[PDB]
Amino acid sequence: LAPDGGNIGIGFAIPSNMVKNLTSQMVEYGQVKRGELGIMGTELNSELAKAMKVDAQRGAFVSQVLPNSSAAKAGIKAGDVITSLNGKPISSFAALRAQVGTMPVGSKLTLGLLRDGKQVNVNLELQQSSQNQVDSSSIFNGIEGAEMSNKGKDQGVVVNNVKTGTPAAQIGLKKGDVIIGANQQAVKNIAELRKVLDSKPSVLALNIQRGDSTIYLLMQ
Amino acid sequence: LAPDGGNIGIGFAIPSNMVKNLTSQMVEYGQVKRGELGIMGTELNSELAKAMKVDAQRGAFVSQVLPNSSAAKAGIKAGDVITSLNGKPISSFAALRAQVGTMPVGSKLTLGLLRDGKQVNVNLELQQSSQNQVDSSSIFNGIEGAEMSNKGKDQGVVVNNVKTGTPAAQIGLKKGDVIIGANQQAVKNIAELRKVLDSKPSVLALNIQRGDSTIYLLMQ
Amino acid sequence: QMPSLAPMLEKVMPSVVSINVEGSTQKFMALGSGVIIDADKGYVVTNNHVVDNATVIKVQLSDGRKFDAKMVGKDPRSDIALIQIQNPKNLTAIKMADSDALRVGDYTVAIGNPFGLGETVTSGIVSALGRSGLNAENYENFIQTDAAINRGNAGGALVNLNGELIGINTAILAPDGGNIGIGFAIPSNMVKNLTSQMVEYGQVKRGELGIMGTELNSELAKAMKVDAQRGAFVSQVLPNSSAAKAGIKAGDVITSLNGKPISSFAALRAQVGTMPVGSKLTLGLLRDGKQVNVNLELQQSSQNQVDSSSIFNGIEGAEMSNKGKDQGVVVNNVKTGTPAAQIGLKKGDVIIGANQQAVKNIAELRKVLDSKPSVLALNIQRGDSTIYLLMQ
């Protein structure tokens, strides 16, 4: 925080537990596979707490749970208040978001709950998601277009959603494509891919699958 | 090639084998029935060849094969390189296009292939296509509108696709029509048709079939 | 049963290459042709005007293959440059013919890359020999031919029916940049000399007779009572020159060099202008109606060559040239506002190494530069002192 781009005594750092998770994923995959509980929430402020007769001036208020979500399955109901994650008391909703927002899918966690004045304990398993990440640009450096992300196990890079006037689709890039190799090298995930690109070839020969067909997309 | 429309030492002729094929078709039909292998390709340049680890600096690179195509059936895979047609080494993709682009449908040919450093030999049969040819104009001289082409054996001239404000549809010309005669003369193909037109009648009485109905379209 | 150039060309076309160039002085692209002179080392000759001021040079064989090439020599006065394919494999060089045995009836075929279409061959005859005057500051002794030559043909081959190289296609007379039947190639004897020097030194060490002259035209010949309508007229000889020592007097006419009759003054200039210092030659002389024969030894000179720019690519400043034996590169004459002197470059400096590599001549130097270091540490001698000049 600083008017006039000079330090005044207030600065911020990402806590290291978050760095430890986020990075470790990147190492093994080239991106972060984001898991979700599938609840909508908001900061539990003192006013909201009266409205809801809860003894607690801070926490995550559950506005609603998504159907067929981890939360759902686990028994979390709307109008619940989350007070602790894995033993650790919860500053706020944002903090909560931030915590789980950095754990990998499949992680097993436990939530401190508070429904109708009664403390609750619930076991959850982080699940899939629709995380908006890694655009075609972050890997091609300048090739606007469809977003991309890993796929299943080490199954290759999947193209999420192509735009229109975006340069990527202007090389034959179509959503639903599954980059399975490049320049005679196998691509299991975004890291491998970025690796072939690190060598900086003149022509990039993408080996993709559209439906039940192998095809090749070329670049320069 | 010539800035300023004067000769400078560089001129081009269509090779005679191509003339021999193209013309012979025209003689017997009034147009060329274009056959296709149904592969997408591009020039195999030296850069692309490294990307693909191929020993070959020239040829046709197979970007992908169409499903239910001659190529498909024959066993040609994307990322293949075509090096020879019928014994004859292949300059480039264009040359290849140009060769087959002038053979008649049903022609039997054989391809020199190169997949993963290994030479391959494949037998093909030129198949149908969606060739964009003979507009209604090339036969009516000035009657814009739907495109036309022969149909099956000597079954008459078929109207491909009518436009809108095009003068042809402005005489009742509708796509899917099958000109089966004109002025009490039978029309098996575009040559026959153009023949009735050679006499230059004042009124042209087209005998067409729309669906299960015979109708007549008139001109002047 | 049909006559054809095909059998010959089949052996010969691999020798000729296309050349693409990226440069700046403002970014440009250019293209022309080149000829493989030595298959093993990947030496490729071409016109200096094609590869001049190039940041990047790529060479493409007739078979498709591309390579990168780096400069090794260049002579603007004659418009010949020598480059070298980096990592040459399985190449074909051309055999050179003796251009001095060419005659005007002779058949010629030209090979090169007009408008970047690809390797194109066209044919004609020798229309003329010894043509000069195109650019009067240069050495020029052009073969003239009506084989079609256009833009992109520069640096390419002019060969005879046996596929021997007789010239390098260089220029064309032509309003409107299209061929009209008149094109020019540097004769191959000149290429053979100029290049061979470049190989061994990075530049040409130009020798001089030290005579001033001019074309002996028919009018001048009357004025001087000489029986001869062509040749080199000696206007004056320099003191302490080869000519001087040899006994050549002003008002002499030179009619032949080494047995070979002499078209004109320009031709003469062009011949010797391409022989290396120390060469021993003999002159056909004509003083007061009497034939004379004289033995000469080509001597030093003040040749204006290799600017600091031709080796640094963009570093204006002092000119440079080899020095004595393999003694290093000497800086000729620094300017003022020129960027070179703006790095501490002072005339009289003797570049004796760079980046811990020894520099005997311009080729070696250009070699350290080929690696493209980030910082260039010049090891120079000013007077009796070693110093270091730095760049980036």
UniProtKB/Swiss-Prot annotation, chains A, B:
Induction cue: By heat shock. Transcriptionally up-regulated by sigma-E factor and the Cpx two-component signal transduction pathway.
Impact noted for substituting I8N: Stimulates the proteolytic activity at low temperatures (20-30 degrees Celsius), whereas at higher temperatures (above 35 degrees Celsius), the proteolytic activity is less efficient
Consequence when changing N7I: Loss of proteolytic activity
Domain PDZ: from-to ranges: 26-117, 123-212
Knockout or disruption consequences: Decreased induction of Cpx two-component regulatory system. Increased accumulation of periplasmic accessory protein CpxP, increased accumulation and toxicity of overexpressed, misfolded periplasmic proteins. Increased resistance to hydroxyurea, probably due to decreased degradation of misfolded proteins which eventually leads to decreased OH radical formation.
Localization of this protein: Cell inner membrane
Protein residues bound to substrate: L37, G38, I39, M40, G41
Highest rank taxon of the organism: Bacteria
Primary role: DegP acts as a chaperone at low temperatures but switches to a peptidase (heat shock protein) at higher temperatures. Degrades transiently denatured and unfolded or misfolded proteins which accumulate in the periplasm following heat shock or other stress conditions. DegP is efficient with Val-Xaa and Ile-Xaa peptide bonds, suggesting a preference for beta-branched side chain amino acids. Only unfolded proteins devoid of disulfide bonds appear capable of being cleaved, thereby preventing non-specific proteolysis of folded proteins.
Quaternary structure note: DegP can reversibly switch between different oligomeric forms that represent inactive (6-mer) and active (12- and 24-mer) protease states. Substrate binding triggers the conversion of the resting DegP trimer and hexamer into catalytically active 12- and 24-mers. The conversion of 6-mer (DegP6) into 12-mer (DegP12) or 24-mer (DegP24) is crucial in regulating protease activity.
Note: DegP is indispensable for bacterial survival at temperatures above 42 degrees Celsius, however is also able to digest its natural substrates in a reducing environment at temperatures as low as 20 degrees Celsius.
Family (UniProt): Belongs to the peptidase S1C family.
Name of the featured protein: Periplasmic serine endoprotease DegP
Native source species: Escherichia coli (strain K12)
Shown part of the complete sequence: 255 to 474 of 474
